[model samples]
Target: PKIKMIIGLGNIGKEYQDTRHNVGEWFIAKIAQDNNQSFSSNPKLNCNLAKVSIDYNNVVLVFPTTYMNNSGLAVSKVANFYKIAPAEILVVHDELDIDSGEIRLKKGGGHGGHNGLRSINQHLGTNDYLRLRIGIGHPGHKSKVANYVLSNPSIAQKKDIDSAIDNGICFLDDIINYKLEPVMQKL
Candidate 1:
């Protein structure tokens, strides 16, 4: 159950930068920075990929160059090229159900209307992959969900999100080691 790949869901554009929808991308970038790794465009995979080793585990970090709704296309390409099973991948994405700054780690679930997750499920043909859900809170109404996620979070909200990212980053080693239970409890 070791994670061989980690994919962060986000759109590709300067305008989407720092938006609520891109927290997953932020997580991947931070991990790459901390590991002294850098992403390079992989056209075949349709993603920016970073390869890094945590202890003995060789992990591939991915940022899809496609829009959020097309995330599955890039993900399936990478998974196939690397021969990684659905269970061996970890996908990080924002969650509307959890409170801001809260994070959860679990395996397999419905998309909950997140376009990124929805696309992933469609392309991957399975929901067996692990997920790191970083909470961004809700917009108080279902009708505003789209605009809310696309907008930049307030300063205070950003702080909470960053702290949540930090919390998840601290346990990357455990995740790579297939020791998810304790990390889940802590998160």
Candidate 2:
């Protein structure tokens, strides 16, 4: 199966920048940089986005303008326009339950309380899209998980998060080249 698009869901604003919640946006930006592509705003999609064409596939990458909770609207709209299946999309997002630097990829599952994914399921009419989870470490005694993700990491923690983002970019490359399962094993 071909991955027609890569969808990184996140809120668009200065306040959300560099937070754990912005990992998806961060990953997509790195992908663009790695491939020498640049992002521009698309009012139609309501996302600042990048695109590149490969020999094996033509790719359209998007960072939805919609907030994280309503990410599915943009995804469903773009995918339906291009006739892409749910399986043909990859969603990179943060996971509160996993430790920092951890990554997980799965074909389908329950939302695990991710509002963004919940909307995706509603809009796409399936709970079967590929989900790439980037761990944000435990919330610990934090009163709000959302706040935890939005806050910047400490210096020591930033080191691992940076590494995780780098590794995530590599994992996404493997996925684009049809090597995801093995890459997952390695991760």
Candidate 3:
């Protein structure tokens, strides 16, 4: 099935903007820009929201404002309201498992210590949704993980990050309307 709800997992606040943790925000916002759409704040959903169509497949973009760990609060409300199935929802979030400048797509998995993923899985009542893991790389020690993701990437790093995100955005059409396997293989 094709995904219709695209959620970007990130903390809400001016301080969190552009940090590695908000790569999901970067990706989704870029996608909205590419689609000629803009997001508006919706208190009911507790997220910044937007709607756009690709080949007539209506999709919703959400940037949760309940913070990273409680992202599910917004996601669940949107999903239930739209009656979107778990498999038809796509989550884009920062990944420590993969190095920076890389991106991976998968369906159904554990949260891998990602609070955003954990929260979404909690609300969805299942871990069977599609995930687009945007790599932010690990910061060496586990204790440094927090500081690392919260820090902004270097200029060169940002370029690489943006490029990878562009690749992911380009694949949105394939994800929403066509089979994912071929696109999955391309990435």
Candidate 4:
């Protein structure tokens, strides 16, 4: 399916900038930079946004500034304003349950305890949007989940994460070409 917008859900603050929670922010910003586009703040919408055209398809790239749990506030506004459906939006986020650097692409069903996704589902009133989960690996203990996501990855882990992000970015052409199944197989 064709994508109208690609959103990276993350918190806003210098402190959480490089944490696992901000992988979406990193990917979105990198995508913008790679395409020579610049993000413009939309305080009213609570997001940092950019746009690029590929084969006449306008793809919106977003970075929510409403904090992780309130990401839907910005996401729903963007989707509503552009008249884009949930299925037409691809949301990128970190997945701690998966092995480090693994990538999973799929259309949604449930939030899987991800607050950002939960917020999005609530605001959009559905869990049908596309999702790209970049693995960060979970802390051994369930109690460490919160701190784990907020912590920075080690040098090696970061390298792996970056590589996985690169792999994901390379599939943007497939996404733009509306070759979802083929792209998912690439994962």
Best by TM-score: 1
Order the numbered candidates by TM-score, best leading. 1, 3, 4, 2
Model 3 Cα shift for residue 111 (angstroms): 0.6
Candidate 1 regions exceeding 4 Å error are 182-187
Q: How many clashing residue pairs appear in each of the predictions shown?
A: 0, 0, 0, 0
Once superposed on the true structure, which residue ranges of model 3 sit more than 4 Å away at CA? 182-187
RMSD of 1: 1.5
* Model 4 quality (TM-score): 0.93
Task: Give the lDDT ranking, best first.
Answer: 1, 3, 4, 2
Please write out the lDDT profile of model 4 over residues 43-117, one tens digit for every residue. 888898899765557789999999999999999999988898888999999998776677777778899999999
Q: Over 4 Å off in model 4, which ranges?
A: 54-56, 182-187
**Model 4 accuracy (lDDT, Cα):** 0.86
Tens-digit lDDT track of model 1 for 1-187: 7899999989888999789999999999988998899999998899999998777678899999999999999999999999999999999999988877898887898998888898999999998889999899999999999999999999999999999999888888787666777454355
* TM-score of each prediction: 0.94, 0.88, 0.93, 0.93
Best by lDDT: 1
Residues 1-187, candidate 2: write the lDDT tens digits.
Answer: 7577888767889988777787777777777887799988876766666777645466778898889888888888888777889888888888787777777777779888788889889999998877778777877864778688778777766677667877776566567655657364365
Q: What lDDT is obtained when candidate 1 is compared to the true structure?
A: 0.89
- Each prediction's Cα RMSD? 1.5, 2.2, 1.7, 1.8
Task: For model 3, name the residue pairs that clash.
Answer: none
Clashing pairs in 2: none
Span of 10 residues, lowest total lDDT, candidate 2: 176-185
